[model samples]
Target: HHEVLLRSTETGQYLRINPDGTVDGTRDRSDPGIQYQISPEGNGEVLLRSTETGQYLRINPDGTVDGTRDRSDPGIQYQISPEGNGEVLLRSTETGQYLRINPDGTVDGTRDRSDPGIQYQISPE
Candidate 1:
């Protein structure tokens, strides 16, 4: 089971999803919500489960990323693709949109690759 810290390329903060469906970036990697399990789902896709809550990261139909308790939900899956420079883009396996960290630190799913918010650097904690 490989794990990684997802640092936002736009804000240089680590991504974290709260139980209340709030997704934001935090400077503290020590926060339990910031740690994630990179479970391979084959074919370059993965299930990112929060280490604190044991929930999978799911992009809702409204494009918001949340920690979902249901492991069987296909929306929890994402395609992690390298974008070079130690960064990668997380594309939803269900929506075909990239995960983006908004300017306000909120998360969204978008099809625009030109947005810098879509890029995230992955590193072992």
Candidate 2:
């Protein structure tokens, strides 16, 4: 497992996982909500575990992202691929869409790679 901070390329904000299982974009990394543990799930997939709540990043059936305590859940799996230039794409294994940070700071799934909201820069913290 590795600690990381995900910075959104589209909005210049940091990704944060709230205790209530909500994912959003924030401007600060000093908060514990912005820290995550990057754990490999094999086969190029990974589990983005929250550093604050110790829950894995999970995608709901409706294409929304949240934190879940179950690491074994398939919805918790994500294909993390580099997009070059320090940016990457977090594709949900359950939805086959990229993790997107909406303008309202909510996390959702998107299939469009062209969408700027789906681009994220991973930084080791």
Candidate 3:
């Protein structure tokens, strides 16, 4: 039931996982990369598994990402903080940074919780 679309509040675009494992934003709501199997990892943590690539969203120390096929990696864990109105902030469990959507359609992580790119509205498909 957690399968959802991570649409940016700032850009109004959905986060999509590319075939190469990179993350980007797309206006297409039906994009296959936009579907993520969000599963609970315990303690209110979650792991984002791409429905298109069947890989995990792995956040690097620099806030960049590539899919992690390994399910046990700590980098795949995230804690969601609801910001009200169906909007939320996804903070990386590994780096403790907020998931960010850039102006140029890139998706990454940022330490700044107040960054406009950090808030996303989750919608169920």
Candidate 4:
């Protein structure tokens, strides 16, 4: 209804967001989750902290996500959805592409995102 903290569920850390719409934030080894403001389309900004690097993930309703580990580094690919009840998909910017997945966390055959060189992350209003 309001916001969802992008928690690792695996590490129990909070995923934080940066100012420039990047996923370059600190990874807090705490409890519960990370914070984020979502949109009607089920997309929103995220703040995540990993052992290697902190990042921000812009999650879309369609389950596509963009992650920026640093302010300078180009964002990567990711996804979160109720796939087969609940599932998370994370892609790589190295591939320079987006894949539409299914509820089973399998590729749904949707190809070519709206953009390539440019990436988008959902933000607060």
Best by TM-score: 3
Q: Residues 50-85, candidate 3, lDDT per residue (tens digit)?
A: 887888888789778668778987788999899898
Deviation from native of the Cα of residue 82 in model 1, angstroms: 0.7
Q: On TM-score, who's better, 1 or 3?
A: 3
Using lDDT, rank the candidates from best to worst. Answer: 3, 2, 1, 4
Question: Worst lDDT window (10 residues) for model 1?
Answer: 20-29
Spell out the clash pairs found in candidate 1.
none
Instruction: List candidate 1 stretches off by more than 4 Å.
Output: none
| Candidate 3 Cα lDDT to native | 0.85
Local distance difference test, per candidate?
0.83, 0.84, 0.85, 0.35
Q: What is the C-alpha local distance difference test score of candidate 2?
A: 0.84
Local lDDT at 13 for model 4? 33
lDDT by residue (34-91, candidate 1, tens digit) is: 8889988888778988887888888877877777788898788888889887789998
**In model 1, how large is the Cα lDDT of residue 35?**
80
**Cα-based RMSD of the predictions, in order?**
1.5, 1.4, 1.3, 11.4
Give per-residue CA lDDT, model 2, range 1-125, as digits (tens).
Answer: 46899888888788888888877888876888988888887888889888889888777878777788888777888888888888888888887878888767778777887888888889888
**Model 3 alpha-carbon miss at residue 109, Å:** 1.3
